[PDB]
């Protein structure tokens, strides 16, 4: 009932991304570098046939934290600077040369003959990593094998050997003296007693680790005259076994390159790109922040309608800058700025998209660029365009005509229009166009300590009915911040379905007009009806516009009386 | 849960071989300090269907990282997902960032009294993956 | 008797507008030469001037521009040198002389073309400094020829007809009367018979024609050499016109003059320093200042801008609150801001946090925030400190390091006038509330709920702090974007109000607490007295810190139960 | 407010009235390339001279006033520019300066300082916004 001894592969490698991140870190600094891994032979996953060899960033540290019974296996890593070199190196020769170092050190101390090696190539442009593990297992001589038959009568020695290897973690083997006690390997004491134990990394039943080849090879060098002995394969599990062994037939045979997932002999590849893609990471974490508002707080809150809303902003000033900042925060991906201005040196202090160095550049194009600078995935366009004020004679008729046409094109193609402009008279032309094109409109107007926020979308528009919304008005800083956020909050609240029978939504009330005041810290809410005589509303004006086009626009701008008479307001 | 109470239950949980005797785990390891547990798991059949149905990709394996959040003084489960591909006709593994992570089931995804850790494991891990 | 030797006033008084130099810089980037054109207004001449102002702008480089109706176009040129030394080394008398020869060669063909001007220049574009010298070629051929004259009042009747004739023909500097006694263009055959000459005068000085008269008379002596005695009319568009009985006399050779004298009356170049345009920092600073001043002089006269400008403001936390507060602070003219935050910029951070870009991820928040303020307004004095603020109800991760941070935090609180607690949760508020209370500093608190916010102020009957008395300030809480903007603006508006003499100020009310809500779009204002058992303000707690120092803090942090005992809140 | 064409007519009338030309302060009076603006180069009053020596410690060469029409405000806007008297090589130099305090320099635009905002409209405007704080004649 005797058999020849076979072997399982010594180790099973797992390299955590920290190892490659740490390997990358050193490729930017300065040959092989030393590695140290702690083996846990008490707890081995069932899925594995050998103890897992686990590498991290801390594996580069020469002395790291160990648990009590763990075994500090030592090794080295060879990093080639060109992929072609990595391929063309002979694997069978290289692992042999490592084994010679293992064989050499094994004669000095039999416990230093076990190690590992990692050949590697780091591609830092694609962040791709090629590695191959190997364990320098050597059978010396190549012809000499081991015949074994079980001897269960030795099972009483297992515990003695288990607790011995636990205590001495730097020792891979042990023998018996004349007193039947466990001690260190000695060539003298072993020839007499003929009992040798090996710490086993294999969980394969009656199949010891290939490392055993190394120990039996050193045994034959030290004690050439020992043909027959007893071999103990010691495991921290219940699967330890004793073997009655004999040697039966210089040249050394070196094996132990690690197979891959497919069982073929071939390197492993890890692709760490997508750590190189911060645009996608930022995109996903940002959306996931948004989703947290939905699942945790307001389950029926609709995010997708806000993300899919195309927003036109009229004016790039203080309001426009903050409004767009509150919009990209709410997940809005498409914003179009319209401004005729240029960034002044003073602008950045009240206008939150610009910097001092940005003076002299066109605002509209720059505001959009600034959004992409905050969050690189944004559909953001500036348009340099003038909005004609009513009650003024046209400065350039042909030019403003083009800009009139371009404004309607912009309004039609956008879902919601914000009126952020500087003055009351600048609101009229967009209010009319947005009426015709059936677009939802939010207004924001600034007074000294007061602000106004309302929705056009019957409710009726801005024009439907002291420092507020004037060209020269200088406002307290707080006013613009207040009005900007209330505008966006009104807009998001407006895109939500109304609860049955009431005005409210999932985000709460949706008032018609909000008028805030800084001195008393108070918010007023007022609801206004639509008016048949309004200059920007009335069907009389709407049908006048449809019929006469730009000619009705031109005359209304230069002569508001003509507009008031059409609407029947005078 | 106190830090040290969590440190003791993490080492007991590890030493019980409960994860090592799981069918899914390729590897189980504690970090440099004892503050954490890295679980490398084999993808369940149900996950493999999902990622191929949604992302049209093959799953390689899943890394779960059991950590202690010192902000909330509570455990935090971190998740990394890996893809199966090839380069030269040999297997390549790739860290992926799922276009939809939620329907599939330091860059990591994150999940949003003496029996504490064992319960929290059953709820936050064993529930969806299965034991 | 009653006869004189005719003298001459300088032809022109030069004024070069700053826009002329702009165009000069612009063309050098786009020695040499180049034509100029200037329009003379001879009807309206400032009383302080002895001759018509010669005024050149950027539009002077264009050969055809829009003149007014009675104005006279004057052709000239500019010579720019690329080296200052080349400008100095130019022989002026020789240069102006060979300009006169060009005026003479033109003058014999057309007598109206013998008048022009010339500018030599050196533009230092580094320093934006400009050297110019104007000159007006004036020649006497022969140089030995003078002009003896006497008044001729009988010809005063021709003054009106010459004024209108010169008005109409603006390219013409001279006219004569023909045999029909009518004003006509200059003709050498006609003047020979009639012997009457009219010249357009640029001088306003009585009985002293412009030195340009030398040019015309030099050509008159070439065209009709035998005319010794004629009548000379000097035509002006004011009452200064005069008529002369003229005689050429002797005392060929050509004398040349007409380099313009400087403000000192000496022959030297003028120099214009435009360097102040190269200081946009100063321009920006003054712009921002005057905009602030408009809030005072135009609207609220009693408003103190200076107490705000001098205020040293400590910002605890770099988050959404810290970013919006700081922006609203610099808008109010606050120049000194210290950020305190332990964080690093996330890739997702920039979208909620207004001081950061996508490219800024990986950088320390506190420093970068300060660095960003200088990117908005470079004159800002702004620093930031990476510092941890220990949360109450938690064990200390690093005792040694958090001890140091505790000392640095207190030092910073001593250094600043106003403290903002912008921190993530209630747990982070306790320690700075205590320290600021000990150091007796004005504090503004801003806390965010999902749809709500709280803004309040610690006092200097007492108001009492944040701790005196549902998703608000929770640290796991994700908040609606509008909340932080709202909170931040009210935080700063409350601050600037507070710096004003009062319980209301020139800026309006100064409440203790402001709670806004998004869902009904409402704002509440509530007060609250200092609580006796609060574990922040309570004299027993103040007593406890003063005696025990850091040992008390370490214990109160890790065991809040111990804190309730001291405060006497335990019994409650 | 007041129409652009009413202001254009009154500016040319005021210009041709020589009221600025007969002013003792004016070195030069000129309209721009259009007829819609008026640039006034002025001799410093003694008080301004005293102030720039007190406040800026510098000598004032002259000041520039530009009467312009803003097609936005529909009102006249007065731009101001201040020049310093200086020297380099012994040659007197003039330098456009940006006063630390320009409010106190007197008693009270892209590159300019600016003052902020019926047939007799413009003539009266000049009286209040110009002739008030500067001596006439
Ligand atoms: Zn309406
Ligand atoms: Zn208190």
Swiss-Prot record, chain A:
Keyword Transferase: no
One Pfam family it belongs to: ThiF
Consequence the record notes for mutating residue 450 to A: Loss of interaction with ATG8
Result after altering residue 427 to A: Loss of interaction with ATG8
Motif range (GXGXXG motif): 315-320
One Gene Ontology biological process: macroautophagy
GO-annotated cellular components: cytoplasm; cytosol; extrinsic component of phagophore assembly site membrane; membrane; mitochondrion; phagophore assembly site
Residues at the catalytic site: 472 (glycyl thioester intermediate)
InterPro entries (UniProt xref): Atg7, Atg7_N, Atg7_N_1, Atg7_N_2, ThiF/MoeB/HesA, ThiF_NAD_FAD-bd, Ubiquitin-activating_enz
Effect ascribed to mutating residue 489 to R: Impaired homodimerization and ATP-binding
Transmembrane parts of this sequence: none
Xref: Gene3D superfamilies: NAD(P)-binding Rossmann-like Domain, Ubiquitin-like modifier-activating enzyme ATG7 C-terminal domain, Ubiquitin-like modifier-activating enzyme ATG7 N-terminal domain
Effect of residue 472 to A: Loss of interaction with ATG8 and ATG12 and no more formation of ATG12-ATG5 conjugate. Defect in Cvt pathway and autophagy
Keywords: Autophagy, Cytoplasm, Protein transport, Transport, Ubl conjugation pathway
Localization annotation: Cytoplasm; Preautophagosomal structure
DNA-binding recorded as keyword: no
Location, primary (coarse class): cytoplasm
Gene Ontology molecular function terms on file: Atg12 activating enzyme activity; Atg8 activating enzyme activity; identical protein binding
Subunit structure: Homodimer; homodimerization is required for ATP-binding. Interacts with ATG8 through a thioester bond between Cys-472 and the C-terminal 'Gly-116' of ATG8 and with ATG12 through a thioester bond between Cys-472 and the C-terminal 'Gly-186' of ATG12. Also interacts with ATG3.
Similarity field: Belongs to the ATG7 family.
Function: E1-like activating enzyme involved in the 2 ubiquitin-like systems required for cytoplasm to vacuole transport (Cvt) and autophagy. Activates ATG12 for its conjugation with ATG5 and ATG8 for its conjugation with phosphatidylethanolamine. Both systems are needed for the ATG8 association to Cvt vesicles and autophagosomes membranes. Autophagy is essential for maintenance of amino acid levels and protein synthesis under nitrogen starvation.
Name of the protein this chain belongs to: Ubiquitin-like modifier-activating enzyme ATG7
From Swiss-Prot, chain D:
GO CC terms: phagophore assembly site membrane
Keyword Transferase included in the entry's annotation: yes
Alphabetized Pfam families for the sequence: Autophagy_act_C
Main location: membrane
Assigned EC number: 2.3.2.-
GO biological process annotation, one example: cytoplasm to vacuole targeting by the Cvt pathway
Keyword annotations of the record: Autophagy, Membrane, Protein transport, Transferase, Transport, Ubl conjugation pathway
UniProt topology in membrane: Peripheral membrane protein
Broad EC category: transferase
One term of GO molecular function: Atg12 transferase activity
Subcellular location as annotated: Preautophagosomal structure membrane
Biological role stated in the UniProt entry: E2-like enzyme required for the cytoplasm to vacuole transport (Cvt), autophagy and nucleophagy. Acts as an E2-like enzyme that catalyzes the conjugation of ATG12 to ATG5. ATG12 conjugation to ATG5 is required for proper localization of ATG8 to the preautophagosomal structure (PAS). Likely serves as an ATG5-recognition molecule.
Quaternary structure note: Forms homooligomers. Interacts with ATG7 and ATG12.
UniProt similarity note: Belongs to the ATG10 family.
Identification of the protein by name: Ubiquitin-like-conjugating enzyme ATG10
Annotated organism of origin: Saccharomyces cerevisiae (strain ATCC 204508 / S288c)
Lineage: Eukaryota, Fungi, Dikarya, Ascomycota, Saccharomycotina
């Amino acid at each position: 009932s005797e058999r020849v001894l076979s072997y399982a592969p010594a180790f099973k490698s797992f390299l955590d991304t920290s190892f490659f991140q740490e390997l990358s870190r050193l490729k930017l600094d300065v040959t092989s570098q030393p590695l140290t891994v702690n083996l846990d032979l008490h707890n081995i996953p069932k899925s594995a046939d050998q103890v897992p060899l686990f590498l991290t960033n801390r594996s580069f540290e020469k002395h790291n934290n160990k648990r009590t019974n763990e075994v500090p296996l030592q090794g080295s890593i060879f990093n080639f600077n060109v992929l072609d070199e990595f391929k063309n190196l002979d694997k069978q020769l290289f692992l042999h040369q490592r084994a010679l170092e293992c064989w050499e050190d094994g004669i000095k101390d039999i416990n230093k003959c076990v190690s590992f090696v990692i050949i590697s190539f780091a591609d830092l442009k694609k962040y791709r990593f090629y590695y191959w593990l190997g364990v320098p297992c050597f059978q010396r001589p190549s012809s000499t094998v081991l015949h074994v038959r079980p001897e269960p009568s030795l099972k009483g020695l297992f515990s003695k050997c288990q607790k011995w290897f636990d205590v001495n973690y730097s020792k891979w083997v042990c023998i018996l003296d004349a007193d039947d006690e466990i001690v260190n390997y000695d060539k003298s004491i072993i020839r007499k007693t003929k009992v040798l134990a090996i710490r086993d990394t294999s969980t394969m039943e009656n199949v010891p680790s290939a490392l055993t080849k190394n120990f039996l090879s050193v045994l034959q060098y030290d004690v050439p005259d020992l043909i027959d002995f007893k071999l103990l394969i010691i495991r921290q599990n219940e699967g330890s076994f004793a073997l009655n062994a004999t040697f039966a037939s210089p040249d050394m045979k070196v094996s132990g390159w690690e197979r891959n997932v497919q069982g073929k002999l071939a390197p492993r590849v890890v692709d760490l790109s997508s750590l190189l893609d911060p645009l996608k990471i930022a995109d996903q974490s940002v959306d996931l922040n948004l989703k947290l508002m939905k699942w945790r707080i307001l389950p029926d809150l609709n995010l997708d309608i806000i993300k899919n809303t195309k927003v036109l902003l009229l004016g790039a000033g203080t309001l426009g800058c903050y409004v767009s900042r509150a919009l990209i925060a709410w997940g809005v991906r498409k914003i179009t700025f319209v401004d005729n201005g240029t960034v002044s040196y003073s602008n950045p202090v009240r206008q939150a998209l610009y910097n001092f160095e940005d003076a002299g550049k066109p605002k509209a194009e720059l505001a959009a660029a600034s959004l992409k600078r905050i969050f690189p995935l944004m559909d953001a366009t500036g348009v340099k365009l003038s909005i004609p004020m009513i009650g003024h004679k046209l400065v350039n008729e042909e030019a403003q005509h083009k800009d009139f046409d371009r404004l309607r094109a912009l309004i039609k193609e956008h879902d919601i229009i914000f009126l952020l402009v500087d003055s009351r008279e600048s609101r009229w032309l967009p209010s009319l166009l947005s009426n015709i094109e059936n677009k939802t409109v939010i207004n924001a107007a600034l007074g000294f300590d007061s602000y106004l926020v309302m929705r056009h979308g019957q409710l009726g528009c801005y024009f439907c009915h002291r420092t507020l919304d004037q060209m020269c008005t200088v406002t307290r800083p707080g006013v613009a911040m207040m009005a900007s956020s209330l505008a966006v909050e009104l807009m998001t609240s407006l895109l939500q379905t109304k609860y049955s029978g009431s005005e409210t939504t999932v985000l709460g009330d949706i008032p018609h007009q909000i008028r805030g005041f800084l001195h008393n810290f108070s918010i007023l809410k007022l609801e206004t009806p639509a008016y048949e005589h309004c200059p920007a509303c009335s069907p009389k004006v709407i049908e006048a516009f449809t019929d006469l086009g730009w000619e009705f626009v031109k005359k209304a701008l230069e002569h508001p009386l003509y507009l008031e008479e059409i609407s029947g307001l005078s | 849960i106190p830090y040290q109470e969590w440190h003791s239950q993490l080492q007991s949980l590890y030493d019980s071989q409960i994860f090592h005797n799981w069918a899914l785990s390729q590897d189980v390891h504690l970090n440099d300090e004892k503050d954490g547990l890295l679980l490398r798991l084999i993808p369940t059949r149900q996950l493999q269907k999902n990622t191929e149905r949604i992302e049209n990709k093959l799953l390689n394996h899943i890394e779960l990282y059991l950590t202690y959040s010192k902000v909330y003084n509570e455990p935090l489960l971190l998740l990394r997902i890996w893809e199966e591909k090839s380069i030269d006709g040999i297997p390549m593994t790739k860290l992926m960032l799922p276009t939809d992570i939620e329907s599939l089931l330091s860059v990591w995804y994150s999940f949003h009294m003496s029996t504490y850790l064992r319960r929290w494991v059953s709820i936050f891990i064993f529930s969806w993956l299965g034991y």
